[PDB]
Design a protein around this ligand. Structure first.
Ligand SMILES: Nc1ncnc2c1ncn2[C@@H]1O[C@H](COP(=O)(O)OP(=O)(O)NP(=O)(O)O)[C@@H](O)[C@H]1O
Ligand SMILES: [Mg+2]
Length: 394
């Protein structure tokens, strides 16, 4: 029907080129290549993280595209770099991370009963036998940090492998690209394991996408994925104008792409063979992440303040001043929640924390606060209320 290749719209499709974040991909690729193309092997550890609470902003895509580029460029010089991708949500312990990494190399290394260290040794040996290099992406890295099943000392040996496990010929052949959801992963590493954190040479922060970038991203999906007659620029603008973070949206490329997908299948299902504006607009309106586990981690008192900031937004008065907020907070704790209001000192810590979680923006002129514009205010009020109820009962 409308599609010339539907797989261009699947969640792990990686485009043959990047048109947004291209420079960041080159910079990352170059740090690896600089070490490798100068005969110093592969050993760098770098990280990609995103804005706090933002999803679908290219963390995974950038990391995989970059490694892909390192591999193409190294082959022009005849080198051989293998790629291994591990999502650390999908792996409780280092033993599991490691056996996933060997599965991907294809090397015949027996992992039954082998300690994490020993698997790493066999890996180092096979890379030496073969004359190969291995660039490892560890995605959702933050889950490797909040995991009692993985010990500080282990991450240490993993991320400092060439100091702990030297190769036969002294050629370092393993580098790392860590991908974490946000800066807290770094904050945590600094406070808990600064000897591993210090190994990270380059940290790259991915922000949410502006409308212009989303437009560029949708245009590349249309070109590769849609038949040329099916779409028009304006169709795509309709998506990017709403989702752009400069326009009050998510800035999520995942959401934008899924909208365009949906609009196309909505056309097919009707018997149309091109898009129309109605279908695109339709798609945008049936097509937003609120992570309850983040809220559940918050104390009742933060949750009460979050709620109040949210309702001030829902009633068309976006931006509430410190004074009124405090008043409503004292008012609200006692009457609505039957808890005594916390003192000023504790209160300010709570407001700060909400801000640092990106849930609320704060601006002076005496402080003004608002819900993050991209947050659905009534969905959040709902979620928040139930969490307060559950914490109290407990
Ligand atoms: N610069 C880009 N160029 C082309 N496609 C992109 C870009 N950034 C994101 N995408 C696409 O947008 C979708 C979401 O990207 P993804 O790399 O999975 O974001 P993410 O930050 O890892 N999402 P999440 O882990 O859920 O917070 C995927 O289909 C990507 O291929
Ligand atoms: Mg991801």
């Amino acid at each position: 029907g409308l599609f010339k290749d539907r797989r261009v719209f699947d969640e792990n499709y990686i485009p043959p080129e990047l048109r947004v974040r291209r420079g960041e991909a080159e910079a990352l690729a170059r740090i690896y290549l600089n070490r490798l193309l100068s005969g110093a092997g592969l050993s760098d550890v770098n990280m990609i993280y995103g804005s706090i609470g933002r999803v679908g902003i290219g963390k995974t895509t950038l990391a995989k595209f970059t490694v892909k580029r390192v591999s193409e460029a190294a082959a022009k010089e005849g080198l051989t770099v293998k790629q291994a991708y591990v999502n650390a949500f999908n792996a409780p312990n280092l033993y599991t991370i490691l056996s996933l990494i060997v599965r991907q190399t294809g090397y015949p290394i027996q992992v039954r009963g082998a300690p994490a260290l020993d698997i790493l040794k066999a890996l180092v040996d096979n890379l030496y036998v073969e004359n190969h290099y291995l660039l490892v992406i560890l995605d959702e890295f933050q889950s490797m940090l909040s995991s009692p099943r993985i010990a500080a000392e282990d991450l240490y040996t993993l991320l400092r492998v060439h100091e702990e496990i030297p190769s036969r010929d002294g050629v370092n052949r393993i580098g790392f690209l860590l991908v974490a959801s946000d800066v807290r992963a770094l904050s945590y590493m600094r406070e808990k394991i600064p000897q591993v954190e210090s190994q990270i040479g380059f940290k790259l922060h991915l922000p949410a996408y502006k409308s212009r970038e989303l437009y560029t991203i949708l245009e590349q999906r249309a070109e590769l994925g849609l038949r040329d007659t099916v779409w028009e620029p304006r169709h795509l603008e309709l998506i990017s104008d709403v989702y752009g973070e400069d326009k009050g949206g998510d800035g999520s490329a995942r959401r934008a792409i899924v909208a365009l997908k949906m609009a196309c299948e909505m056309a097919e299902a009707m018997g149309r063979d091109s898009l129309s504006e109605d279908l695109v607009r339709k798609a945008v309106s049936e097509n937003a992440s609120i992570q309850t586990h983040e809220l559940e981690a918050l104390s009742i008192h933060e949750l009460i303040i979050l709620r109040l900031i949210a309702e001030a937004t829902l009633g068309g008065m976006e931006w509430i001043n410190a004074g009124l907020l405090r008043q409503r907070y004292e008012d609200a704790s006692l009457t609505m929640y039957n808890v005594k209001p916390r003192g000023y000192t504790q209160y300010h810590i709570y407001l700060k924390h909400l801000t640092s979680l990106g849930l609320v923006d704060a601006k002076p002129s005496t402080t003004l606060f608002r819900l993050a514009p991209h947050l659905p205010a009534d969905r959040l009020i709902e979620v928040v209320d139930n969490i307060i109820q559950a914490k109290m009962a407990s």
